[PDB]
Amino acid sequence: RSIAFSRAVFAEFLATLLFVFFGLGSALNWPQALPSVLQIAMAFGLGIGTLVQALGHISGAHINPAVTVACLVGCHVSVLRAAFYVAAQLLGAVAGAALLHEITPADIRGDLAVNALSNSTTAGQAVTVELFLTLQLVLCIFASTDERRGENPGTPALSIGFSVALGHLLGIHYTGCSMNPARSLAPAVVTGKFDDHWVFWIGPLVGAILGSLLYNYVLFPPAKSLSERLAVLKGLEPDTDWEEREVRRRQS
Amino acid sequence: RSIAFSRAVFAEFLATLLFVFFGLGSALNWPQALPSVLQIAMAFGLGIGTLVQALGHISGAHINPAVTVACLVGCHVSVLRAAFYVAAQLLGAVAGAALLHEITPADIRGDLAVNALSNSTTAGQAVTVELFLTLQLVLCIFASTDERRGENPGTPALSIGFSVALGHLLGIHYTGCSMNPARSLAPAVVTGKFDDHWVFWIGPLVGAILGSLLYNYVLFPPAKSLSERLAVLKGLEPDTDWEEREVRRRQS
Amino acid sequence: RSIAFSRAVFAEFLATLLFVFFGLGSALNWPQALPSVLQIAMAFGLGIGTLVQALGHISGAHINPAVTVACLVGCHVSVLRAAFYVAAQLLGAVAGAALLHEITPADIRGDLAVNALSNSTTAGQAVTVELFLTLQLVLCIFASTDERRGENPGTPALSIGFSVALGHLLGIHYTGCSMNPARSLAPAVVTGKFDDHWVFWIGPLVGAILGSLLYNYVLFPPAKSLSERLAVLKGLEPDTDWEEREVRRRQS
Amino acid sequence: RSIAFSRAVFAEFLATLLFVFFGLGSALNWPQALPSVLQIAMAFGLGIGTLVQALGHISGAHINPAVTVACLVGCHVSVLRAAFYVAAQLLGAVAGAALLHEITPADIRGDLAVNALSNSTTAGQAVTVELFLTLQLVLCIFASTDERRGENPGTPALSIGFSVALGHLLGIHYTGCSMNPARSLAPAVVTGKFDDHWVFWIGPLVGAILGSLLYNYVLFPPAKSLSERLAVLKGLEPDTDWEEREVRRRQS
Amino acid sequence: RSIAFSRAVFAEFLATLLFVFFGLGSALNWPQALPSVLQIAMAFGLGIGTLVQALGHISGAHINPAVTVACLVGCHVSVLRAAFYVAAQLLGAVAGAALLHEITPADIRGDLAVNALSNSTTAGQAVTVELFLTLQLVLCIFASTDERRGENPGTPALSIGFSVALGHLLGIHYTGCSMNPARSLAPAVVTGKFDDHWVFWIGPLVGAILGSLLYNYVLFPPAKSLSERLAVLKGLEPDTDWEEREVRRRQS
């Protein structure tokens, strides 16, 4: 260690700073125009879309820890690169929400777009929810990150973005929809709401741990490899697709 | 029997529990923010795109039986895999909705987003519309599931999702937009309201049997053949392509 | 003449029957949930997206006469194939709106989603509007239909769809937004409103005549060819992209 | 001087007249249906996608000066073409808006969708936000204008459009979402309200000069180089590719 | 790396989740029938014996952070698999505690088999107690697991079943009996009583660490090793290799 491994951290740093900034502001309980639920789901999912395409190369754009842990339970990511990843998503998230809280005037930062049990739903329900909410996403990710599909490359960006939105449009009412704890952590950090918390620890982790396992062992045949998958995804462009077809034709 | 297929069922058992668990919730009459037709349409279409995206190298994601009947009547598929898949989807649906009944508190779990005739239309109007709602879609599907369009490989997941939504945007006032019985089935199972059921059995079957037949025959082949189609769809990827054989003879 | 030339007519017939059906219903002044302008713009643009992808192969999916006339002023289409095209879009449109008027109950078919000068706008303004409204579209089309771009094939479907929506979100208030007279003709046919009509004859025709000329002569260098462009676009798949690269490598 | 370039200016003279003529109209305070933040965001983003789509083989469609300053500072472009393009865009803007003033009747042409600070925020907040609104975008742009990602060629037009919209969904309450002065400029020209102008001069320049510098250097090269980048962008297509040279030596 | 360890870690999450679910369930202050101590005793103890013979071949089924730190200080385990287990134990415990808190209605989830001072004694006396309570088990475990002792193999599980039974038979009256910090964390965790917390972290940590030195150093002769033991545990059925080399050396 190390060389460029670092820059990819900023890409993830920057990406989430933005995503929270964009998202939460787009998600606050603003009195004059109350973000419609879809407006909110869309904001974040798009944030992700921009981030996943812009800093898509560099990262694989997990822009989700559940997704990265998902990537771990299936071995798409290491254990070292993982913790450093987690860190970037976290501090970036709260940085974005921090700039957001200071760029944002006092009157509409009431809730501050908190992830909160709404309308008398128990946490078991919610955890169950967030679980599948992320699960689908981790799967989306997995499906878009699978090396075995490079002729139809797109769209990690949008696909994963809308898988996030997808979850969002649901968890907003159970939970505000985490699927991606940072979305739920940053605002909570800035103003302080811990009611029925763990929900977004296990559901998502499960759903993500699920999604991966489903992907990497259940749905793994000659395909969702382990070493080569990482070699490729981490290898990035100009990737392949290519080397296989060249060396193969030269051969036969 | 069997190989990896199981994993696809699990992929699909997984898939429908989700689309429904997310879905139904997204369309309830929440008094604070009552979902617009469009928001709900978006929920599912997004769902479709993600699930269709998540579990493909394993399952293929028709995420519609009429579409299977379409693909079936279009000879895109055979006779056994159909019945076993239908079962997996149904039980996933009620799995999510029971988990949901358990996930959902007592005071607001009333209608449960049942598919029901809206705005003084007879059953025949509803069935008629669903025909086309699905037809446009099945066509979108068949065209997007088209192997033969690798020059414009895009955009299966979202095309079908947004076709589903397209259908939703009209079909919500005529039918609530089933285009796909399970969505109507799960909640109905849980609560007990059954008038003029068959309406939402017939239309989709017409429109889909149409769309396929229109697509697979009226528009014969369209390059697709019948069985050739099945071969390609079965190889999953990788396997036998036009440009492959091209670059391969050019060098010998 | 002739062989398959015919089937492509149905593809265009079917496509627009649907698009109007979907669109107008999605565009009527329904009292309970008044289609939001965007809902309306989206419905049609999507209709187009489905149609442009589904029957995208077959057609090039003008799903717009202005676009086809555009294709003519630049020679992307013939004069015979043109009139037969116009006919299909027209009778299909009104067929769809006819089924729509009969499938649709009496109370909300008041206006019937008419293209109408709204809020004291003169026709000169409107014609000027619709002009550019379609113009952009014809251009979109032209940009997506250009043979010279086959490595980035997509998305005639969506691109053109949203170029239609794009115009829609505007002309809805000037005009209801034609950009594509059929959208304006069919409902008007079924119920009968001819106030300030010609607007949607010249603006769009101009804007489309413009868009093409801009494309085919202004913006035409070794590229927006005339004969070969047609050979290719009409030639359809498996097109090229290909033959050029093969025969070229075999050569050099 | 000169060759075909003129056609691109005309392509672009054409382009901005449009985006604005459509745009401003889409965002007015129509009393019957008052545009939601989202509807308006959609209007423009769709605009961007279409215009960016329409006139590319000729112009390239930054459809943002900050983006040029980004591409400029990122060495994606030189020093003269900038000034002449800026002029073409500006005059197109006022062309549409004057045609619009002529296109628009007296009773409702009041504010004219002016960019103005909303919800008690200081100029510095506005400028700060626009930074990021644009930054995410410029990054999206640069990543989508990336030659180097041909394994995932998608999705420039819409990515940038929806990034523009993403920016819109937050930026409307902070700034109305300029991300691009002309949108604010045309109407303002027509009506005369000029307080604290400079705000919307500075932010975009920061965020875009950032995004590029972040993209072109902080994230150095990123494969892009400086000049190499310019070469590729200049060849337009067709010209010098990686897989081309591959298949070409393989046969010799 | 890696081979078998993985699932083998996951099993402990699961395992402790069990022992505690049962455990707490058997030790509650149900108003109607307050568990007689032996009921509870045989409950936990037979429970463990079950968990040990059951999950003996994969993990060693410490089912106790104490038992692991013993396995640790005895140089019977590596350092990582431990942190991993224990995390999994704790995390498992509380997973279970959520599931248990969910399984139970509000009226009788009062005490929650909290390890809790019942019937009048100070904490120091209580800890002095938890130490020996866990240690006798640690020793019986060490006593029944000796590779060096084969003439009295049966019945590790049962004698142990009966050992933990025997321990609770005492521990219910005073406390309900942890012997397993995890077992004590979970309830306290969910119910919120971190009263005398360290008591059940230190005692078990402490009591476990003694037995470990006596078996492995003080009472160490030509047998109770470091290495041979670890190798045997690490191997399993098959992949074990010391026993053949021994028989091969012995038959000649």
The CB density around residue C2, as the number of other CB atoms within 10 Å, is 6
R_g (Cα) of chain B, nearest Å:
19
Instruction: Name every residue whose Cβ is closer than 8 Å to that of residue C69 and which is 6 or more positions away in sequence.
Output: C82, C205, C208, C209, C212
Separation between Cα atoms, residue D247 and residue A246, nearest integer Å: 8
Q: In chain D, what residues touch A46 (CB-CB under 8 Å)?
A: 162-163, 165-166, 169
Separation between Cα atoms, residue B133 and residue B121, nearest integer Å: 16
Separation between Cα atoms, residue E134 and residue D118, nearest integer Å: 66
Two structure tokens written together for D33? 């249906």
Does B251 contact chain D (CB < 8 Å)? yes
Separation between Cα atoms, residue A128 and residue A205, nearest integer Å: 11
Separation between Cα atoms, residue B194 and residue A163, nearest integer Å: 33
Mapping DSSP onto H, E and C, the string for chain E reads CCCCHHHHHHHHHHHHHHHHHHHHHHCCCCCCCCCCHHHHHHHHHHHHHHHHHHHCCCCCCCCCHHHHHHHHHCCCCCCHHHHHHHHHHHHHHHHHHHHHHHHCCCCCCCCCCCCCCCCCCCHHHHHHHHHHHHHHHHHHHHHHCCCCCCCCCCCHHHHHHHHHHHHHHHHHHHCCCCCCHHHHHHHHHHHCCCCCCCHHHHHHHHHHHHHHHHHHHHCCCCCCCCHHHHHHHHHCCCCCCHHHHHHHHHCC
Strands (E), chain B: none
Helix axes A199-213, A181-191, angle to 10 degrees: 160
The CB density around residue D7, as the number of other CB atoms within 10 Å, is 21
Does A242 contact chain D (CB < 8 Å)? yes
A53 to chain D: closest CA residue: D140
Instruction: Name every residue whose Cβ is closer than 8 Å to that of residue B245 and which is 6 or more positions away in sequence.
Output: none
What single letter denotes the amino acid at residue C7? R
Separation between Cα atoms, residue A43 and residue D118, nearest integer Å: 19
Exposure letters A174-213 (e unless 16+ CB within 10 A, then b): bbbbbbbbbbbbbbbbbeeeeebebbbbbbbbbbbbbbbb
Separation between Cα atoms, residue D156 and residue D147, nearest integer Å: 11
Helix axes E156-174, E37-55, angle to 10 degrees: 140
Separation between Cα atoms, residue D140 and residue D156, nearest integer Å: 8
Residue that has been written with the tokens 């010098």 in this structure: D240
Which residues of A, range 114-153, sit inside 8 Å of E by Cβ?
122-124, 127
Two structure tokens written together for C136? 């952009």
Separation between Cα atoms, residue C112 and residue D71, nearest integer Å: 48
Does C213 contact chain B (CB < 8 Å)? no
What single letter denotes the amino acid at residue D45? G
Separation between Cα atoms, residue B176 and residue B28, nearest integer Å: 12
Quickly count helices (H) and strands (E) in chain C: 11, 0
C97 in Cβ contact with C27 (< 8 Å): no
Cα–Cα distances (Å) from D174 to A35, A188, D41, D136, E163, in that order, read: 14, 22, 14, 16, 68
Residue that has been written with the tokens 């919500």 in this structure: B172
| Cβ-defined contact of D142 to A54 (cutoff 8 Å) | yes
Chains with at least 3 CB pairs less than 8 angstroms from chain E = A
The CB density around residue E249, as the number of other CB atoms within 10 Å, is 8
Side-chain half-sphere CA neighbours of D137 within 13 A? 40
Start-to-end CA distance of chain A, whole Å, equals 38
A180 in Cβ contact with A134 (< 8 Å): yes
**Helix/strand/coil for A111:** coil
Instruction: Please write down the long-range contacts of E137-143, taking CB distance under 8 Å and 24 or more positions apart.
Output: E137/E67, E137/E163, E137/E164, E137/E167, E137/E179, E138/E66, E138/E67, E138/E70, E138/E207, E138/E208, E138/E211, E138/E212, E139/E211, E139/E215, E141/E52, E141/E67, E142/E74, E142/E211, E142/E215
> Which of D2, D16, D26, D164 to mutate against chain C (most C CBs within 10 Å)?
D26
- Candidate from B47, B55, B157 with C-beta closest to A159: B157
The CB density around residue E99, as the number of other CB atoms within 10 Å, is 15
| Cβ-defined contact of C139 to D55 (cutoff 8 Å) | yes
Instruction: Name every residue whose Cβ is closer than 8 Å to that of residue D52 and which is 6 or more positions away in sequence.
Output: D61, D63, D156, D157, D160, D161
E201 in Cβ contact with E181 (< 8 Å): yes
Instruction: Name every residue whose Cβ is closer than 8 Å to that of residue E33 and which is 6 or more positions away in sequence.
Output: none
Chains with at least 3 CB pairs less than 8 angstroms from chain D = A, B, C
| Cβ-defined contact of C158 to D153 (cutoff 8 Å) | no
Chains with at least 3 CB pairs less than 8 angstroms from chain C = B, D
Closest among C37, A166, C183, B48 to D46, alpha carbons compared: C37
Alpha-carbon gap: D140 to the closest alpha carbon of chain A (Å): 4
Cα–Cα distances (Å) from C19 to A68, B45, C7, C173, D34, in that order, read: 42, 18, 18, 20, 27
Cα–Cα distances (Å) from C100 to B210, C41, C182, D7, in that order, read: 19, 18, 14, 44
Cα–Cα distances (Å) from D162 to A47, B93, D208, in that order, read: 9, 33, 16
D250 to chain B: closest CA residue: B251
Residue that has been written with the tokens 């005398």 in this structure: E196
B47 in Cβ contact with B68 (< 8 Å): no
What single letter denotes the amino acid at residue A105? P
The CB density around residue C122, as the number of other CB atoms within 10 Å, is 16
A145 in Cβ contact with A76 (< 8 Å): yes
Separation between Cα atoms, residue B183 and residue B114, nearest integer Å: 8
Closest among D196, C231, C47, D215 to B135, alpha carbons compared: C47
Q: In chain D, what residues touch C137 (CB-CB under 8 Å)?
A: 50
> What burial class does residue B81 get, using C-beta atoms within 10 Å of its C-beta: 0-12 exposed, 13-18 middle, 19+ buried?
middle
What single letter denotes the amino acid at residue D202? I
Q: In chain E, what residues touch A123 (CB-CB under 8 Å)?
A: 98
Mapping DSSP onto H, E and C, the string for chain D reads CCCCHHHHHHHHHHHHHHHHHHHHHHCCCCCCCCCCHHHHHHHHHHHHHHHHHHCCCCCCCCCCHHHHHHHHHCCCCCCHHHHHHHHHHHHHHHHHHHHHHHHCCCCCCCCCCCCCCCCCCCHHHHHHHHHHHHHHHHHHHHHHCCCCCCCCCCCHHHHHHHHHHHHHHHHHHHCCCCCCCHHHHHHHHHHCCCCCCCHHHHHHHHHHHHHHHHHHHHCCCCCCCCHHHHHHHHHCCCCCCHHHHHHHHHCC
Separation between Cα atoms, residue D239 and residue D231, nearest integer Å: 10
Phi, psi of A19 (to 5 degrees): -45, -40
Separation between Cα atoms, residue B61 and residue B51, nearest integer Å: 7
Separation between Cα atoms, residue E35 and residue E51, nearest integer Å: 22
Exposure letters B93-132 (e unless 16+ CB within 10 A, then b): bbbbbebbbebbeeeeeeebbbbebebebebebbbbbbbb
The CB density around residue D230, as the number of other CB atoms within 10 Å, is 16
| Cβ-defined contact of B155 to C155 (cutoff 8 Å) | yes
Q: In chain B, what residues touch C33 (CB-CB under 8 Å)?
A: 36-37, 173
Method: electron diffraction
Start-to-end CA distance of chain E, whole Å, equals 36
| Cβ-defined contact of E95 to A202 (cutoff 8 Å) | yes
E216 in Cβ contact with E139 (< 8 Å): no
Closest among B170, B187, B183 to B65, alpha carbons compared: B183
Separation between Cα atoms, residue A52 and residue B211, nearest integer Å: 35
R_g (Cα) of chain E, nearest Å:
19
Alpha-carbon gap: D179 to the closest alpha carbon of chain A (Å): 14
Alpha-carbon gap: E12 to the closest alpha carbon of chain A (Å): 16
A152 to chain D: closest CA residue: D152
Separation between Cα atoms, residue D113 and residue D30, nearest integer Å: 11
D in contact with A (at least 3 C-beta pairs within 8 A): yes
Torsion over CA: C233, C235, C239, C241 (sign): negative
Two structure tokens written together for B204? 């989709």
Does A169 contact chain B (CB < 8 Å)? yes
Closest among E208, E134, E125, E137 to E174, alpha carbons compared: E125
Does B31 contact chain A (CB < 8 Å)? no
A63 in Cβ contact with A168 (< 8 Å): no
Helix axes C37-54, C156-174, angle to 10 degrees: 150
Tell me if the bond preceding C221 is cis, omega within 30° of 0. Answer: no
Cα–Cα distances (Å) from B243 to B247, C56, D11, D248, in that order, read: 6, 22, 36, 15
D53 in Cβ contact with C164 (< 8 Å): no
D in contact with E (at least 3 C-beta pairs within 8 A): no
Start-to-end CA distance of chain C, whole Å, equals 38
Chains with at least 3 CB pairs less than 8 angstroms from chain B = A, C, D
- Candidate from B129, B146, B219 with C-beta closest to C103: B129
C25 to chain B: closest CA residue: B170
Separation between Cα atoms, residue A157 and residue A144, nearest integer Å: 9
Resolution value in angstroms: 2.6
Separation between Cα atoms, residue E156 and residue E140, nearest integer Å: 8
Closest among E200, E17, E16 to E100, alpha carbons compared: E17
Closest among E21, E200, E13 to E90, alpha carbons compared: E13
E76 in Cβ contact with E230 (< 8 Å): yes
